[PDB]
Ligand binder design. Structure first.
Ligand code: ZN
Ligand code: ZN
Ligand code: ZN
Ligand code: ZN
Ligand code: ZN
Ligand code: ZN
Lengths: 76, 76, 76
């Protein structure tokens, strides 16, 4: 299925994914497409911060959903 | 009066507003223009997060001010 | 050495620096190139918000590192 990821650089990136894909998997796809290290990526869906070990299914992310890519902030 | 709203991508939206307008009103204006649900919009002025029930004049947002539209981050 | 800085919208700035440069020094370099007042700059490295009185060395920022500008948020 496809989802879309909006970047601060003004891009909408289409990704081919499955419900069972982890957020880690999605970040790896973004690295392939956009060259951004996964450890600097934060994904947002309807305001919610998506955790690496959860799946798209876990967040009820369905076909043609839009995510936003923002900078991951860590503290320290 | 006019204010300017910069999106995450740096696009400037020009809005016709009034000093007594609420932030909720301004977000409705962005929805009508851009189709972003107000629920998903966060506005920032000079670093400060703007609350929906307060007015532009409450925040000393004057003619020709610039706001930033960012994601309305939430738990869950 | 050289480092890179990404603007709010992902433009890349190249800076000449030394390890002993303070973050305040870096922000002055950014002001000279981009015009952004230092008091409005917030720099991130490895997800961490950088403090003006600390140095690049203090953050283990080495040659060819990338920093990001993000919107400077405040309370009130
Ligand atoms: Zn499969
Ligand atoms: Zn957006
Ligand atoms: Zn009126
Ligand atoms: Zn700004
Ligand atoms: Zn970046
Ligand atoms: Zn020197």
């Amino acid at each position: 299925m496809q989802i879309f990821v909006k970047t601060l650089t003004g891009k909408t990136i289409t990704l081919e994914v499955e419900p069972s894909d982890t957020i880690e998997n999605v970040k790896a796809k973004i690295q392939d497409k956009e060259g951004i290290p996964p450890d600097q990526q934060r994904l947002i869906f309807a305001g919610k911060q998506l955790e690496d070990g959860r799946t798209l299914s876990d967040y009820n992310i369905q076909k043609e959903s839009t995510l936003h890519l923002v900078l991951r902030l860590r503290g320290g």
